[PDB]
């Protein structure tokens, strides 16, 4: 990993945090309602769950293939994100932000269709709504053709078990080898930059032993079934 | 003791030497048979034996179980775990040729395969030495050449299918016919919506089943195999469900055809810049049951309905296949006198599969256009 | 035993009608200590 | 479509059988004839029962046997049972004279020909 407290775009020293890794059986229900969302089954003429399941429209039909059709109209009606709402009916569910153009905050933007720096253009590159445009010549280029489904291992089944091992590393300005699972630090002094300047860099190698979990969530006692890996950042004050 | 037959019959039946169009009627009939009878106590002689029956040694396939038990040369063990087994295979390969026109050749084919395996355990009564069958069951395969061209060119896609609409509609007609066959018209046919069988409350597990089909007879729902198999066949063969066959198997194969026509060249193409012209068309359709078997739930017990309130069926299968293939649908192979030869070919196929495990129809359609041009520019100078 | 699919929720079974649904499979047991990997497993499009 | 009708034939056959053997049977509006030998201490369309029944033809040839208690859902059985069983408590015994249309129908099954009258002796031992 690259130390974020050394280079030109370094973070403030007060912006410390933690990165957590989870290994094991992790719930695929990203929007926790007990139902498996797949956006290739949505549409105006498709049967939905008769009471709306707390996050938007969920198709009531059994999923068969995680694939869209080529018809642009069905794609527009379907590629609406994990919530199942086409950004105009999202205000009924996300009532605290109904006045915005994207109440759910899941709109996708191509990195060449945005403005600003590199990080600014990738800010909405992982949105699940509008990220599967039929035409590759669309100014909002798709970046994927697969529907967004709450099933990650592609076994057609949505797992809801949360039995995993948890590891954690700190992210601090002055990390050194010997603690925080740090095994190596390579300091690079003279980096040639496209603008003609130079910057300092610091690469840190982490080796977190799998056999020594920091915590255990749920009932998992061995490593014979490790199906999912999650990593999340927390504890930071500003952009990192 | 094991027995086996390999019957085979071949007939050419040259119709030669308005019906004189037929020339040859090739008939092939193969019949394999086999019998395995365990627990056969007696031994054999130096030159052989004829103890069970002289026919069995030469492949009679007649019933020797009861005779063997009566004569007392079957095992007296009352927990015999070995099963009497019988195998049978029939293959019919009728072929014919027709010459309705001097430059028009027609080939007709008729195919029918039927394989049947029966297996059963048995005991011999200690008194009277009587053969007692125990849990006999049957399975096998079926296939027959059919004609389903009446729905071949009907458009079928994600938004419309006339044949599938007919499949949906024929379910009630077939259910009513089966109910009249079961309830002998002496009383009103009980249905899921009448007073005697009212729709239950929302808590009853049968509420959804009863609501999904209110006008259908009690034992014949929309999901009954015996209801939607003949409906499927009638819908995708173009037949009428009011008179179509409700049987699982078919007896008479429907011919598939191959037509060749070198006839248009005879009209005026002798000096009309054509040196060759021929039309070709093929149609081959088959209806296949990959694995049917007997049902142990179809017995003498009063239990006659399953969890879906459907009457138990005597013969059950997982899938039925309707395969249709125009190979080719058309073939125009003509050579011009300017050394330009063109071979155009349209091929079509359908691979319908009805699955009773999930009651789903998987339709695989295929179209292929092939065009081939050949030309020779003469005396090109570089 | 009381897991008989024929006697699902008849008089004293350990299964409800919710055992037939993937969404409510967990609530389909009349028992108390039932887990989604020990007592039962679910598949949505299992192939034969 | 080559159906048969067996209502009148079954009715007259049952009358003849009740004439031969001195038994008095009440008639259900659906054509079922039942004789309740005794009762106990009713099962509904949704109820699992246990029976030691035995079923035979007019000639006395038994077509189905159950010497030990067998469990049935009472909704998967023939209509004749559906109309006869709810007439009594546990421990009671009944004799049913189910016709064809209330039994196996006009086509029947193996060992039971179409249009056959079925005589059942049922001992309901549990309504669990």
Coordinates of C-alpha atoms in Angstrom, one line a residue, chain A residues 1 6 25 36 42 48 54 60 69 85 109 111 129 138 161 170 181-184 195 217:
Chain A
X1 CA 0.0 0.0 0.0
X6 CA 4.1 11.4 2.5
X25 CA -19.5 -16.3 5.3
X36 CA -32.4 -11.1 -3.3
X42 CA -37.4 -5.3 -12.9
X48 CA -43.0 -7.2 -7.9
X54 CA -38.4 -1.3 2.6
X60 CA -41.2 -11.4 -7.3
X69 CA -31.4 -7.9 -22.8
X85 CA -36.2 2.5 -8.3
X109 CA -21.2 8.6 -13.9
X111 CA -15.1 8.9 -15.5
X129 CA -27.9 2.9 -11.5
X138 CA -23.0 6.4 -24.8
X161 CA -25.0 -15.7 7.4
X170 CA -4.3 1.1 11.7
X181 CA 1.3 -6.3 10.7
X182 CA 3.9 -4.2 8.9
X183 CA 6.8 -6.3 7.5
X184 CA 8.5 -3.9 5.1
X195 CA 4.5 18.2 -14.1
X217 CA -18.2 -12.6 14.5

